[PDB]
Design a binder for this molecule. Structure first.
Ligand SMILES: NC(=O)c1cccc(NC(=O)CCC(=O)NCCc2cn(CCNS(=O)(=O)c3cccc(C(=O)O)c3)nn2)c1
Length: 185
């Protein structure tokens, strides 16, 4: 809704942006080899991401609304995620998109399924986690904060509010696949 055409830009190992991303990945995934790291440049998707962030910022106070989190997926999904991000298109904590604090969660073969050539795919994603609570299975949206004021909902949900290892997001444009890590065993 807008075409959200994208460019994919490989970064070189010398690039500081490469190392920022590789370093975060390497905290838990050093034992894998990284074949490449790309930036996904999709200006329509980014513009719609930045619009929801502006809204979230003007609303959540001192809160750092954005976290950078990981998401493993199969090779088939990579061009979908590039065009559309994490679109509306079951589970423990709700029916939305799952993101992980630590790369080794996403690196599991059940998420980042290895292709024919053994390549695995993990995105390093800007996610608007905002204000979060503990989730549950039947959430098709996050719960309301106050029952007296029931339209202001939580922004995301999590497994553990003081020690999260995962977050679930439900809305469109709440997440931007800024980087794709292609790697192998
Ligand atoms: N993938 C990860 O790196 C990761 C990180 C933390 C936790 C988890 N996963 C879990 O704990 C269990 C995940 C699970 O059982 N189901 C989630 C999969 C799912 C997401 N959706 C939402 C539909 N929107 S969609 O466009 O098809 C979509 C959305 C987001 C990602 C994809 C994708 O291609 O990966 C697709 N429907 N099913 C994964």
């Amino acid at each position: 809704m807008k075409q959200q055409n994208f460019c994919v830009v490989e970064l070189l190992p010398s690039d500081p942006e490469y190392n920022t991303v590789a370093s975060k990945f390497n905290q838990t995934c050093s034992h894998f080899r990284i074949e490449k790291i790309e930036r996904i440049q999709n200006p329509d998707l980014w513009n719609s991401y930045q619009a929801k962030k502006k809204t979230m910022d003007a609303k959540n106070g001192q809160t750092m609304n954005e976290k950078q989190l990981f998401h493993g997926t199969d090779a088939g999904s990579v061009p979908h995620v590039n065009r559309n991000g994490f679109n509306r298109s079951a589970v423990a904590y709700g029916k939305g998109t799952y993101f992980a604090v630590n790369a080794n969660y996403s690196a599991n073969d059940t998420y980042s399924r290895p292709d024919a050539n053994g390549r695995k795919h993990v995105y390093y994603v800007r996610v608007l986690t905002g204000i979060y609570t503990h989730g549950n299975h039947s959430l098709i949206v996050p719960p309301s904060k106050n029952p007296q004021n029931p339209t202001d909902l939580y922004d995301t949900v999590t497994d553990n509010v003081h020690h999260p290892s995962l977050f679930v997001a439900f809305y469109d444009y709440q997440a931007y696949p800024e980087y794709l890590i292609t790697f192998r065993k």
